[PDB]
Design a protein around this ligand. Structure first.
Ligand SMILES: Nc1ncnc2c1ncn2[C@@H]1O[C@H](COP(=O)(O)OP(=O)(O)OP(=O)(O)O)[C@@H](O)[C@H]1O
Ligand SMILES: Nc1ncnc2c1ncn2[C@@H]1O[C@H](COP(=O)(O)OP(=O)(O)OP(=O)(O)O)[C@@H](O)[C@H]1O
Ligand SMILES: Nc1ncnc2c1ncn2[C@@H]1O[C@H](COP(=O)(O)OP(=O)(O)OP(=O)(O)O)[C@@H](O)[C@H]1O
Lengths: 317, 173, 317, 317, 173
């Protein structure tokens, strides 16, 4: 009773435009944790999920693809960045609001908090997605101490298979699906203890977002910034047009800023829009019933310009 | 060593000989003194006795592949790691780095220096000999920045006893 | 059911005189967390508040504008200066006295324990203002250790969106509105992890308070020092006149002290007044029914003079 | 009521192919903890199990032989890698599954917990297998501090015989059977405190896995990768043939990678297969009812090639 | 000392004399200067005053028996332990290491050097004397890498006052 990879991909292409091999490897991660169901006893209690390792920049969609696969597949989700067993005790506390959010709006009394003690556990030991953001931040070189390789050691019994003791009972982990992300610009995947490199067989590399890629992320995705502002400003009683020649000057204007400062990724769009929808957001109420055309001419003279700091003339002889 | 860098007509060249000297003897004579950094985006030539000369090279890399290959920023980020309260040791060496945009010279003591108007840089014992031939050419000939680096390096190998005619040159783009 | 930005501004111009762009960006922060209400399901559970970053001196009104927007908009407030999840457990304990106090003073029995753990959390997850004072105090350079960048890391799941477990239940944070302040004289905004620079799109810069600005802050604001002393001394049965030529010599006498010592900001007025209303505050009772005229002549010979220390002649050769 | 060593060996030769002296010493470890039963009172409460020390590479089967002897002999199991008494409190929480799942479908109400608190304990104290992975990681040289020799000291009362206080009662340890593994490439067994070298009489040395050994581990073991994929892809409605000339090119292709990078051991097969069954796993559903022949020609042009990094030309003059 | 290594016809030989010098006096004259590492998989000859010369040896072992005997990688892993922020002391010595595959020279300052085209390596006071005789032979005779090392060592014992004719030679395979 679950989708096909071809469909998981296509359902992700609506909130996370771009990438590719990203979704693919993530899809087959879900698809084969289900195919694990239609099996006897021997070939079923032993077949650990092929964990994933996402290698890519910052703000390219390493966390999105892990989130839009926790709801659009429904399962306990949790993100953590390097106690260790309290990562499972939180995956369980995020199981109740599912096995009792829809079920409470379905069973209507019939409470029985004794089944959410063995039926909400099946909701974890089976459907469990643990996301480790910034895992490259715990590798051997770091130029003084190597205790970051201790965290990588306490975080081993989990990706392997142990029995975490939560307040709902003994929840196994052997079948949970772990996905770790990392920039891996300083270190390399092989800089992780070998006794855990073979517990992350899937290696998927995400790419950065170009000028055109920033153009699409601005509209195509559901609840895109173009729509979010079209709606948040429609409630004021104002309509707003986001022409296409003006979307280019917002994607190729938030990119110009990512290649001259820190590359925060897509999140650069939010800080750009907020400066654009600055003039309107304030006096929107006092301008009820008006269709404002946001084009190249408006966007251009909306923010200004952003050249590099001064680096040189300051500390260089 | 002799490491020299000329820049003419959207061209950035960086050459250096290949003699590893130990005392007054020659241990290795083919050594590559000019290496490529950031997937081939920047050129780096070093001088100053292997060890330090190298660790200075590495440290500038861990700074480029952590600042999107922004030469100038990477440079200063590195320099600032010496100009603090808790120093970063002290390196007996110096680098000549250059990409399509800028060219610099970074010392393992914590300072970054920009060329003079002519955009020529040289370092190492054979340094000034090359720098003298370079300026000579740049200011009186039409030769490409490559031809000049090539010519200047030889002039310097024939005067410096720690520089040979066995060099490796790299250019951008 | 909430004010307009034009009004939030004008209601703030009564306790916090001065600034400008300060209030403006703060206003639209509240206005658009409401406009978020009148929306369907998709474009509603996903539209994080455009957090704010106030860059300004000390004592210019970075905390006031965050407080006079927690009452004059009514919502759980809390100020913190760099555990991390206990910042939410305190935003909830400050959301009690607006139910077991407010919802018993409008719709006055009627207890119901399992009714406050749904009437209060729905108020935090919606109305929540977390204020981080002195955030610039946790940036990369600091000349030895960089663990201050660890706090900036544990304080990430919150500004992003997680589920803090309080004693009242699982309260989400995704929609809370965070406002961080900083002097940013040593560091720069960009010295903060990029994985959090894009989660604070609003950049507002407050200015310092001049001589004239100190003159106004002394009267115009509701409960100004001129009024607070007029009243606290009226209870003694004494009336007091604060002439205008004497307000100048108190603003341009508390400014003279901020440009020759630490610039504590407006809070300098309190320590100045306390030295002025020193002679009166003591023997006010024993002088019932008297109208004292506090003018230039009184203020002048009320405190004295304050020239620089001795710096030089002490340790310089 | 338990098997013979000859049989324990033969039952292990189905999931862990290879090794030899490995199983042998492990077998007699179980066989003689039973022979301890048929004895009077004096020669019974005093005869500590001859603990085992497995010396071998990484991914050769040091943990498998300890796991396939916890189920195929049924007893509380637990793996730990250097609190210390909480290793027993977990061996007990793992004993509530062979008494409440072994006597729930057997002795079948019957509740009486004060009845199983001496039926569960009697178990652990008798059937108890504590596995210490990577014990060589706590020896004297490590070039600065020697607190790792403190862990080797707190982990002494257990291998000796004390009384751990769990939430189920006072469970003795004197008769538990401990098995510790280690690479022992840097250190030597004798680098362990003498007051614990004589509490681990059995010294078994496992060998590494060759080209041929990787060929067998790919099929012969129950739930081998060849079968696991044959089944996980049969559920998609697809059949797949793993010819023999293609199993050699997967064992002698995962070995080629272990002798040019970290030698992760058998776990290398998982990362290799995952790259092979990459093309199929994705579009398996959309290709229902097909018998794909995976031979030398397919495997060859399935992954590509893997030559060493670049080590030299990068940092060497 | 005088430590030399020649490589000819799938042969890798590494020899060295056996004179431990203290001041201008000879303390021990049989000393084994070329030892075997990794169960006999790699050859190592050292020079540079006992203590440091030794601790450099050990450090390269703890790196081989932690990298599957991969000479080059073990070498660089060790070198990198000097080129960091927190240095690894500084050793007054150097090693000539070689297995069936490659041959190197590692200094306790943090640098790894590859031979020149002829694949000949020498170190120590009597270094260049052996290296001169070696190149002489390799380039003009058919002698085996063993015969050459043997011959080259003697030529150097008769010129260096800190090198004797009492040597120990090891070869691979
Ligand atoms: N491919 C994409 N298409 C559209 N929006 C994207 C994409 N990738 C990221 N975003 C946007 O980025 C924000 C979330 O960032 P995200 O969690 O994806 O970062 P990341 O790539 O995981 O990096 P890090 O984990 O290092 O911060 C959201 O605003 C989301 O819309
Ligand atoms: N513009 C102003 N108008 C009225 N009162 C002000 C103003 N600025 C500051 N104050 C007074 O200053 C006090 C609060 O200072 P506040 O916390 O705003 O300082 P800040 O500028 O945020 O700096 P920091 O956070 O570094 O202390 C209150 O007593 C408040 O009345
Ligand atoms: N002899 C063997 N026969 C079959 N599979 C084996 C064998 N040895 C190891 N494996 C495989 O190795 C994986 C488990 O590795 P295991 O934990 O046994 O390695 P280890 O060397 O004991 O542990 P560590 O790497 O923690 O020292 C499983 O995929 C298992 O199939």
């Amino acid at each position: 009773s679950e989708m096909t990879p071809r469909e998981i991909v296509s359902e992700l292409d609506q909130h996370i435009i771009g990438q590719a091999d990203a979704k693919r490897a993530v899809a087959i991660a879900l698809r084969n944790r289900w195919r694990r169901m239609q099996l006897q006893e021997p070939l079923r209690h032993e077949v650990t999920p092929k964990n994933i390792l996402m290698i890519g920049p910052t703000g390219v969609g390493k966390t999105e693809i892990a989130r839009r696969l926790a709801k659009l597949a429904n399962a306990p989700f949790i993100k953590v960045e390097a106690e260790v067993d309290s990562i499972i005790r939180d995956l369980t506390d995020s199981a109740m609001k599912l096995v009792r959010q829809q079920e409470i709006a379905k069973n209507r009394k019939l409470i029985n908090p004794e089944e959410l003690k063995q039926k909400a556990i099946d909701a974890v030991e089976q459907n469990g997605i643990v996301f480790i953001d910034e895992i490259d931040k715990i590798c051997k070189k770091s130029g003084a101490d190597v205790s970051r390789e201790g965290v990588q050691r306490d975080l081993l019994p989990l990706v392997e298979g142990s029995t975490v003791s939560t307040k709902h009972g003994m929840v196994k982990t052997d079948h949970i699906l772990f996905i770790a992300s990392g920039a891996f610009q300083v270190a390399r995947p092989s800089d992780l203890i070998p006794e855990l490199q073979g517990r992350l067989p899937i290696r998927v590399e995400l790419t950065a977002l170009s000028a055109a890629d920033f153009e699409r992320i601005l509209t195509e995705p559901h609840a895109s910034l173009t729509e979010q502002y079209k709606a948040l400003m429609a409630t004021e009683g104002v309509n707003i047009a986001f022409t296409t020649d003006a979307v280019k000057k917002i994607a190729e204007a938030a990119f110009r800023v990512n290649e001259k400062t820190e590359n925060i990724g897509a999140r650069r769009l939010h800080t750009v829009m907020e400066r654009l929808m600055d003039k309107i957001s304030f006096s929107a109420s006092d301008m009820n019933g008006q269709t404002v055309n946001i084009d190249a001419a408006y966007v251009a003279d909306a923010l200004g310009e952003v050249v590099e700091n001064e680096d040189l003339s300051r500390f260089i002889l | 060593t002799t490491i020299v860098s000329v820049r003419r007509n959207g061209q950035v060249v960086v050459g250096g000989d290949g003699q590893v000297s130990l005392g007054n003897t020659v241990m290795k004579g083919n050594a590559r003194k000019v290496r490529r950094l950031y997937n081939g985006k920047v050129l780096a030539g070093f001088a100053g006795g292997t060890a330090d000369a190298f660790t200075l090279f590495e440290l500038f890399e861990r700074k480029l592949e952590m600042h999107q290959g922004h030469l100038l920023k990477s440079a200063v980020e590195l320099a600032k790691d010496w100009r603090t309260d808790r120093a970063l040791r002290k390196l007996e060496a110096m680098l000549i780095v250059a990409d399509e945009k800028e060219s610099l010279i970074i010392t393992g003591i914590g300072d970054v220096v920009q060329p003079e108007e002519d955009q020529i840089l040289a370092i190492g014992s054979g340094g000034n000999y090359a720098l003298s031939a370079a300026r000579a050419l740049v200011e009186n000939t039409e030769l490409s920045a490559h031809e000049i680096v090539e010519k200047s390096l030889r002039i310097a190998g024939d005067i410096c006893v720690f520089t040979n005619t066995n060099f490796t040159i790299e250019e951008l783009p």
